[PDB]
Design a protein around this ligand. Structure first.
Ligand SMILES: CCCS(=O)(=O)Nc1cc(N)c(F)cc1F
Ligand SMILES: CCCS(=O)(=O)Nc1cc(N)c(F)cc1F
Lengths: 237, 300
């Protein structure tokens, strides 16, 4: 059934699985028209499909042309997500196929179940975890490839860079979710922490800076502090 | 007018005939039910006083044979049997009618209730849902499971209703996933009506039979089927107008006849609220909506 804190090591076992987050599929700015009415303008979005064991991110870019002349776009976006995830699964070879797909938002269950009817042995699961994957568009290189897209496109990334050469998947996922949670709660401060130091750079083929093991400890501590500092403001505690 | 003779009533039992019912005391001199209207199916059903578990009964049509009830003390139930000797049967009822040992089917002339509940129900279709080809009548009880229930254990004792499943390849055309899931018209009209049932009369017949088994025997799988057949129509944007009008009439009489005190278990809140207030046909069931609102406003 649902994935939560009780069955959490399951994410790093050897059964292939893929988180799917649809938060950033349908993205709009809201604005005023000449007549003083309100309208939306869409911008490019993306499906965030992530194998948590390897760091594999299938980033399907959703170009604004998808939405042209369509109604009920927030509803359509869930079905479009499910269509594209199904197409991704069909495209991969049998041994690269997920055995489970975990959707971050429960409203994705029915659309994905219906699109995956041809795959009865792939379990479609919700999760009780609050995961920060909406903050994917705070990662500069991901935001840039989405906004510059002129047509539908799939782009592949390893969201863990080379971390798995030195740490386990469990630890890599913990670092990823901490970074994204920090970027989600205070993007400006989080990015300042990551780029404060001129001597630390991001490899051309990476998303995050090249920190030593000891520097990652400092960085991780600074991200935890940021999250608590922000929280004592929200709730005044 | 036809008659169903009882050999006796050796155990205390509540006997129903269609929407009527009588209490019969242990060894009370009860020899059957007369004046049964010809032209409709009927159901004769039982609930023993000493074990109210297992309601059971028999669907039959007096035009298809002469049928009588006799208690079997080995299997512990009232059994329907067919008598092939016309004249023997004819004279038995005659003795029993003459000694006034039969209750009369208590049909008010003004009353169309039973016709309205069985308008589309035909014995020949019952016998394909309930498969026991050596009898002309069909046994049903509280515990029998449906084929769909079995898929999710004794097949010869199953209710073979038509399987309806909104998240199945049968319901969803490749390439029309969102369309077919949000508007079930192709599943209703092409798959079910044109393909499986052949016409709306057979569809309504199975819907009515499912309701009656749910009501009379508390058969939970029949209740599932009744709601599924309602939801499939209401969740379709394109339904022939004559079907919507007929459906409103069908459901009105079903809701009218339901015992008030059974609403909790027999009625599925989700299906009814969706059908009357959310679905494509939320404005096409005026009579059903009115009786539902005046009789079961809580459910909604
Ligand atoms: C093929 C490597 C491209 S990558 O972006 O570095 N990582 C990667 C990404 C995905 N999605 C994958 F299935 C396999 C991969 F190795
Ligand atoms: C020998 C008949 C016993 S009885 O009391 O008449 N029961 C009964 C028996 C048969 N065979 C029937 F056709 C109809 C009946 F009602």
């Amino acid at each position: 059934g649902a994935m939560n804190s009780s069955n959490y090591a399951e994410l790093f076992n050897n059964d292939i699985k893929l988180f799917v987050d649809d938060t950033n599929v349908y993205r709009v700015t809201v604005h005023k028209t000449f007549e003083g009415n309100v309208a939306t303008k869409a911008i490019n979005g993306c499906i965030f499909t992530l194998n948590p064991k390897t760091g594999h991110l299938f980033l399907k870019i959703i170009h604004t042309s998808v939405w042209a002349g369509q109604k009920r776009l927030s509803q359509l976006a869930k079905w479009k997500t499910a269509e594209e995830v199904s197409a991704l699964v069909r495209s991969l070879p049998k041994e690269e196929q997920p055995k489970q797909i975990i959707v971050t938002r429960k409203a994705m269950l029915d659309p994905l179940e219906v699109h995956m009817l041809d795959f009865p042995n792939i379990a479609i699961r919700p999760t009780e975890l609050r995961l920060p994957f909406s903050a994917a568009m705070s990662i500069d290189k991901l935001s840039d490839v989405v906004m510059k897209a002129t047509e539908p496109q799939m782009v592949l990334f390893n969201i863990y860079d080379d971390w798995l050469d030195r740490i386990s998947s469990y630890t890599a996922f913990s670092r990823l979710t901490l970074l994204l949670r920090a970027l989600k709660t205070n993007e400006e401060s989080a990015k300042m922490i990551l780029l404060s130091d001129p001597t630390i750079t991001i490899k051309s083929y990476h998303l995050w800076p090249s920190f030593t093991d000891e520097q990652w400890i400092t960085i991780e501590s600074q991200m935890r502090d940021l999250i608590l500092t922000e929280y004592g403001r929200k709730y005044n505690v | 007018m036809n008659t169903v003779p009882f050999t006796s009533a050796p155990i205390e039992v509540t006997i129903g005939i269609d929407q009527y019912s009588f209490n019969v005391k242990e060894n009370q001199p009860f020899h059957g039910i007369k004046d049964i209207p010809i032209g409709h199916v009927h159901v004769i059903h039982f609930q023993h006083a000493d074990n109210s578990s297992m309601r059971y009964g028999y669907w039959f049509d007096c035009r298809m044979g002469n049928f009588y009830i006799q208690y079997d003390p080995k299997d512990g139930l009232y059994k329907m049997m067919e008598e092939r000797d016309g004249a023997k049967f004819e004279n038995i009822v005659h003795n029993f009618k003459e000694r006034q040992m039969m209750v009369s089917y208590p049909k008010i002339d003004e009353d169309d209730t039973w016709y309205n509940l069985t308008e589309f129900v035909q014995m020949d279709k019952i016998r394909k849902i309930v498969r026991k080809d050596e009898n002309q009548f069909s046994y049903v009880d509280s515990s029998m499971t449906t084929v769909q229930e079995n898929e999710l254990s004794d097949p010869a004792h199953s209710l073979n209703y038509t399987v309806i499943n909104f998240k199945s390849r049968e319901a969803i055309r490749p390439g029309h996933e969102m369309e077919d899931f949000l508007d079930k018209s192709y599943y209703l009209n092409t798959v079910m009506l044109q393909g499986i049932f052949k016409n709306s009369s057979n569809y309504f017949g199975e819907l009515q039979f499912a309701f009656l088994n749910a009501m009379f025997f508390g058969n939970y799988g029949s209740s599932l089927q009744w709601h599924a057949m309602i939801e499939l129509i209401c969740s379709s944007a394109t339904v022939p107008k004559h079907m919507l009008d007929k459906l409103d009439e069908i459901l009105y009489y079903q809701i009218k006849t339901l015992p008030e005190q059974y609403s909790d278990i027999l009625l599925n809140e989700r299906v009814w609220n969706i059908c009357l207030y959310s679905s494509f046909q939320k404005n096409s069931l005026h009579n059903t909506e009115k009786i539902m609102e005046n009789k079961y406003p809580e459910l909604l």
